[PDB]
């Protein structure tokens, strides 16, 4: 079997991407944030504290003939940005773009942090990291991908995120019409539960490529590109007037500047991020200082190839018994 679904940016800055997902019988369609950096499928629901819901579409298990409460199971998650949510667990039928999984753990939010309440466009998250990170207790649950793996034609999914435009998540097949050239595959470590890999170096604009190993995770659920302080300083040094701002919390630059591209290495291949992808606009309405899409990972503890980097490529998440990541230009 295969599945294919369109994913759409939630705003004009590509801060996140939502993908419609059918849950329950009859279908309740929710727009979820597909997150390869986490492993919980959780939704706003009829159980969510009413004051904490502001425009989101909610899942109502009581209206689904296939929903079953998972007795005694709870979940609680904290994300690297300080957001958090928690609740109880149902099993139900979940379909993504024609691909159906029965008995998927659907985690019903009873409490969500303020950042989720304020994001009216995101109805929940669909985790696509490895199932060892799932937070359901006392019985850990599998991700949608892990549950679908056996019935997929190929145990893969692909992310084709658009720049200010819709894109595609495919499950079970690789669309050879969606990229140019060849796909370069690189080894993945699952030891931390992430799609963790090693980039072979970088270049700024038309500069010399610096060969150097950068270990990081491929994370569709993170907006920006977080890299070591040395790399990030080398990039922003090429932008006139750019500086790291403690009050703002990262590098900013004059909105009138033109940004250089950023290249990162995948084995012997190169993925080029156009400079326009790194512009995240004014720090406040009307400001002439703009926020940069490449920031330091120093305070985070791990390097993160977020949407800024991934949307410049066609990305294969190969969930074979030895997992790999594939990158191609597009
Ligand atoms: N997108 C999920 C996510 C968020 C944060 C992190 C961090 F901060 F731990 F790296 C990993 C994964
Ligand atoms: N990295 C996971 C994640 C994804 C989205 C959000 C947001 F945008 F809803 F705040 C927070 C955390």
From Swiss-Prot:
Keyword Transit peptide belongs to the record: no
Keywords recorded for this protein, A-Z: Aspartyl protease, Disulfide bond, Hydrolase, Protease, Signal, Zymogen
MF term (GO), any: aspartic-type endopeptidase activity
Keyword match tRNA-binding: no
Highest taxon, organism lineage: Eukaryota
GO BP: any one term: proteolysis
S-S bridge residues: 255-290
Transmembrane segments: none
Group of enzyme by EC: hydrolase
Active site: 35, 199
Family: Belongs to the peptidase A1 family.
Protein name listed in UniProt: Endothiapepsin
Organism per entry: Cryphonectria parasitica
Portion of the full-length sequence here: 90 to 419 of 419
